[PDB]
Amino acid sequence: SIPKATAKRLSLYYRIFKRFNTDGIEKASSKQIADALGIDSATVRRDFSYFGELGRRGFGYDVKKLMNFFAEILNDHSTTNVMLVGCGNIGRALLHYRFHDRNKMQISMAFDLDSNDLVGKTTEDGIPVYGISTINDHLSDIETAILTVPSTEAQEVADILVKAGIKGILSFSPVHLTLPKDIIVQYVDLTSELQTLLYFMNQQ
Amino acid sequence: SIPKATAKRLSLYYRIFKRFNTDGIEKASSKQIADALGIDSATVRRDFSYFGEYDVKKLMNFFAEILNTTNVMLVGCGNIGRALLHYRFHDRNKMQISMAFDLDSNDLVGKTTEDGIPVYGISTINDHLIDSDIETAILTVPSTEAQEVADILVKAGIKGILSFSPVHLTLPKDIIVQYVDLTSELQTLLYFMNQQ
Ligand SMILES: NC(=O)c1ccc[n+]([C@@H]2O[C@H](COP(=O)([O-])OP(=O)(O)OC[C@H]3O[C@@H](n4cnc5c(N)ncnc54)[C@H](O)[C@@H]3O)[C@@H](O)[C@H]2O)c1
Numbered sequence: 001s002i003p004k005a006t007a008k009r010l011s012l013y014y015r016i017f018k019r020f021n022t023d024g025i026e027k028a029s030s031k032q033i034a035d036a037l038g039i040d041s042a043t044v045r046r047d048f049s050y051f052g053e054l055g056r057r058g059f060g061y062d063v064k065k066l067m068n069f070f071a072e073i074l075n076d077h078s079t080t081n082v083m084l085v086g087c088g089n090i091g092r093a094l095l096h097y098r099f100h101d102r103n104k105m106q107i108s109m110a111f112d113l114d115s116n117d118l119v120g121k122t123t124e125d126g127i128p129v130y131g132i133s134t135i136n137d138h139l140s141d142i143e144t145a146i147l148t149v150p151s152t153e154a155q156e157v158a159d160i161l162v163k164a165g166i167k168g169i170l171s172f173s174p175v176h177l178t179l180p181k182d183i184i185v186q187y188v189d190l191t192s193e194l195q196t197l198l199y200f201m202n203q204q
Numbered sequence: 205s206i207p208k209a210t211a212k213r214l215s216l217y218y219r220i221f222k223r224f225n226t227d228g229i230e231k232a233s234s235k236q237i238a239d240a241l242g243i244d245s246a247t248v249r250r251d252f253s254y255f256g257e258y259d260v261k262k263l264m265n266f267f268a269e270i271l272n273t274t275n276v277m278l279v280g281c282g283n284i285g286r287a288l289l290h291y292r293f294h295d296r297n298k299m300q301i302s303m304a305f306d307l308d309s310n311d312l313v314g315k316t317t318e319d320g321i322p323v324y325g326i327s328t329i330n331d332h333l334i335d336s337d338i339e340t341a342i343l344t345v346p347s348t349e350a351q352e353v354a355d356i357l358v359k360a361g362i363k364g365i366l367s368f369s370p371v372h373l374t375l376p377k378d379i380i381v382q383y384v385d386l387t388s389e390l391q392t393l394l395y396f397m398n399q400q
Contacts, residue, residue: 004242007395011388019372036372038208074391077398082390093287099387105394144397146390168397170390176223176240184400186393191293192215193366193382194340195271199214200380201339201364 002050009047010070012037017067028061075104081141083166084110085157086148087118087129090172090190094146096125107146111135113153132157136164147171158185210251216241217251218271221264232258275302277338277362279353280345281312281323284368288342289317302338305329326353329360343367354381 002010016036020028030048034041048055054066084107087095091110099105107127112118114131122128130138145166149157154173161169168184171177174191206214220240224232234252238245252258255266278285278301285304293299301321306312308325316322324332341362345353350369357365358379367373370385 007399008392010395011385011392012383014388015370015372015383015385019374036374074388074395077394080394089287089290090284093283094386096283097386099390103387103391105390144393168393170393174219176220178240182400184393184396186389186396188384188386188389189215189219190288190291190384191299192219193384194274194276194293194299195215195218196212197364197366197380197382198274198340199211199271203211 006047006050010074013047014067014070014074017063017070020063021067025063028063029059030061033061071102075102077104080105080144081108082106082144082146083108083142084127084146084148085112085132085135085161086146086173087112087116088148088150091146091148094148095123095127098125105144108142109138113149132160135160139164142166144168145170147173149173151175206254210254213241213243213251214267215271218264218267221260221267224260225264229260232260234258272298273337274299274340275336275338276300276340276342277302278304278321278342278344279306279326279329279357280343280349281306281310282344282346285342285344286312288344289321290319301342302336303332326356329356333360333362339363341365343369345369347371 016033030044031041034044037044045058048061051066051069054062054069082105084091084095087110094107095110110123110127110129111132112129114133118129119131120129143166145161145168147154147158147169151173154171154175155177158169158171158177158179162179162183167182169186171185171187172190174189177185179185217237220237234245234248238248276299278288281289281304289301289304304321304323305326306323308327312323313325314323339362341357341364343350343354343357343365347369350367350371351373354365354367354373354375358375364380365373366382366384368384368386370387373381375381
């Protein structure tokens with residue numbers, strides 16, 4: 001039963017193991033993993049204690065097998081249909097992207113405000129685009145949403161989606177949402193990421 | 205003297221105290237904050253030890269103070285890249301993309317975006333940098349090119365890279381790299397939903 005903070009690191013560990021794997025490294029020390037990741041080697045070690053037999057020795061981690069252990073935790077769900085809400089910019093890009101088959105996830109419908117051009121039309125990639133008005137009637141097994149609408153619509157729209165039965169939200173809107181307890185929300189705030197980057201550069 | 209892990213959370217606290225200060229809220233709890241971010245209520249308390257002091261207007265100033273004239277370079281004008289060239293980063297815009305780069309052979313090179321962002325050929329990055337305040341790069345090239353282009357950025361004197369490729373960049377220890385990896389961000393959402 002992995003701890004939350006450990007789980008947030010899964011995809012970081014996948015990334016670093018992939019690259020070791022690409023470079024021909026069979027075996028890695030927790031020190032090497034820490035140094036590449038820029039975290040405390042003792043954190044690598046408490047994390048890896050949760051990753052079964054492959055991680056239970058503080059050293060000589062098998063790079064091929066753990067790379068795969070990580071990919072397979074992160075793909076351990078059935079095929080998930082996802083809706084996109086906000087076919088603006090950053091949404092325009094996600095709207096066209098087709099996730100690798102292994103990921104067992106796809107954007108199967110898109111939404112924008114009814115004055116938008118794309119409503120009614122359909123993408124050359126295959127995805128129909130409906131008005132945020134048609135949201136409630138247009139649900140289905142979809143539980144998961146990507147949200148890319150402007151700061152000022154964010155909360156309003158998430159509330160529509162939550163009321164419509166959405167349990168998970170990947171939000172790009174740079175505003176903090178307040179939603180029922182049981183609703184999962186994961187944020188990618190671009191401005192906050194640049195601010196963090198810029199703060200570490202300014203530590204010199 | 206902030207620890208690395210408290211520092212990662214700084215810009216997350218700023219966005220919450222902005223939100224309280226619009227709702228008109230005067231003070232907030234280690235409780236309220238931990239809830240908002242889905243981190244231990246404790247872990248907040250210990251972060252906040254390093255802030256000397258919870259009044260919202262004051263702390264929203266402390267985080268604005270600590271986080272705040274920044275021009276950014278964008279490298280790789282494809283799907284994502286062209287999306288970010290139209291993306292606004294700030295209210296009173298403290299953060300901007302001033303120029304962009306793609307392969308010299310790309311149709312977009314030698315053009316200026318509708319918002320006045322010039323686009324140059326990657327071969328010229330040294331010229332355009334030996335004069336500029338630019339220390340920061342957003343990297344939006346195919347995964348297969350990300351390392352190699354990151355090596356060119358660092359050579360040209362870039363100190364920070366926000367990368368959108370899901371590929372680990374091995375760069376000198378002084379370079380700060382931050383990842384926005386959209387596929388794995390969605391998998392991570394998926395992971396938490398299937399736990400809860
Ligand atoms: N499109 C999405 O919704 C999305 C989703 C998940 C991951 N990503 C990742 O983000 C990255 C960007 O993705 P994308 O789909 O926009 O890529 P893309 O192929 O559409 O665009 C890449 C751009 O890089 C330019 N380029 C190639 N080599 C260069 C170099 N040497 N110097 C300067 N420019 C160069 C190309 O001409 C092109 O304009 C990729 O790693 C991709 O896997 C994107």
